[PDB]
């Protein structure tokens, strides 16, 4: 009886713009999975002078003492801090946020890039959905419980560059010894600052949680800081014409990541073989579509195709008939989403399934205190 539907991944819509991103709030996540709503202890500040690029800074240094906390988390992809942040913005104004879909920027990017990247290259994942009066979308974790250590070292390299280029407090409030210790400092992952952004495409209104690296120039208290953030990005050599094309495909995915949530600056480090930081370069998020149209037309073309697909995708998430029954005490429904063989597939999770009793009755998708917030109107 219930919903089953498929969307063809190379079909595209008509939307070519996003509603201007605005910051609802923020939270920081501790290494202990505690969520600190309206708290910014994990927001870093950028600092890396041009003179530092003359020094042969090594991005492999300290790999053996890496604190990867994120592996040990009980619910790696949990919505809890996003929902708990939304509730705090609703409590002081007495009404729901008018939005249709609540999700992470990472899930929005993983969807949109299906239009271009095949399931293996994309690293396709299960996505899982429910309604309450709006759609809530969650990623299913990787199930893990250029090869082996040489892939883990290329992952670590990104977290070390983000640790070398930043400070935990403003430069003006940081003592000189903390700047000198910075090359010896332990690198860690799963200790984020997450901004909560309101946005939209066509007629769809969206709330995206977005993990941000640092603030580039300055912080304004009690205001949208969205124009002050930057993304610092993972690093590679460029020494030949075909290296420019390998870079341009990474720069497109990086523009897509910033554009969805209004981050205006992208900063790239570059490496030799081995792990010496060779150079740094910086891009405004507005340059990238023009820069790609000039240097590589068939990649620069994808910037419009991505948004024409993002609108089609989000309209068909609402038009593939999940119930949007508004009364927050009416019975819920619950669905899978996949990408498989140029189709995206969606199916209800009927009450016989092991998931169905737990996403409907229990903690696995929406927090009990959030269900009480909204059922108390």
């Amino acid at each position: 009886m219930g919903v089953s539907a498929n969307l063809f991944v190379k079909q595209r819509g008509s939307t070519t713009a996003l509603k201007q991103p605005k910051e609802i709030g923020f939270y920081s996540r501790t290494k202990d999975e505690e969520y600190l709503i309206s708290d910014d202890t994990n927001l870093n500040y950028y600092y890396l002078p041009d003179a530092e690029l003359d020094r042969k800074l090594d991005l492999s240094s300290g790999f053996q003492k890496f604190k990867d906390y994120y592996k040990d988390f009980e619910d790696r992809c949990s919505l809890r801090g996003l929902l708990e942040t939304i509730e705090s913005s609703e409590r002081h104004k007495g009404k729901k946020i008018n939005a249709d879909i609540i999700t992470f920027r990472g899930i929005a990017r993983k969807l949109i890039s299906c239009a271009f990247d095949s399931p293996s290259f994309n690293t396709v994942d299960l996505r899982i959905v429910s309604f309450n009066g709006q759609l809530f979308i969650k990623e299913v974790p990787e199930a893990v419980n250029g090869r082996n250590i040489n892939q883990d070292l290329n992952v670590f390299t990104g977290y070390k560059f983000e640790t070398l280029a930043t400070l935990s407090n403003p430069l003006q409030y940081t003592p000189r010894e903390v700047i000198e210790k910075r090359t010896k400092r332990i690198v860690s992952h799963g200790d984020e600052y997450i901004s909560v952004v309101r946005t939209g495409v066509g007629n769809c209104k969206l709330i995206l949680g977005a993990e941000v690296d640092c603030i580039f120039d300055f912080k304004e208290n009690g205001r949208d800081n969205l124009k002050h953030y930057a993304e610092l990005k993972c690093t590679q050599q460029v020494a030949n014409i075909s290296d420019t094309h390998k870079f341009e495909r990474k720069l497109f995915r990086t523009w897509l990541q910033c554009f969805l949530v209004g981050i205006p600056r992208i900063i790239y480090g570059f490496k030799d073989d081995h792990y010496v930081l060779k150079t740094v370069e910086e891009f405004s998020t507005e340059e990238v579509p023009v820069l790609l149209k000039n240097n590589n037309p068939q990649v620069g073309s994808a910037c419009l195709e991505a948004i024409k697909w993002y609108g089609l995708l989000t309209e068909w998430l609402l038009k593939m008939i999940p119930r949007d029954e508004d009364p927050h005490s009416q019975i819920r429904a619950f669905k899978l989403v996949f990408e498989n063989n140029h189709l995206r597939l969606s199916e209800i999770e009927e009450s016989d399934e092991e998931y169905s009793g737990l996403i409907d009755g229990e903690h696995i998708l929406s927090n009990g205190f959030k269900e009480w917030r909204k059922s108390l109107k």
């Binding site: 070519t16 713009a17 996003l18 509603k19 201007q20 991103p21 605005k22 008018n98 939209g200 554009f259 209004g262 579509p289 023009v290 149209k293 073309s301 910037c303 419009l304 948004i307």
Partner: peptide, 13 residues
């Protein structure tokens, strides 16, 4: 093709 992605003004609520 001169068209490129841009933002639009929100609903003001």
């Amino acid at each position: 093709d001169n068209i490129i992605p841009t933002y639009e003004v929100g609903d003001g609520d």
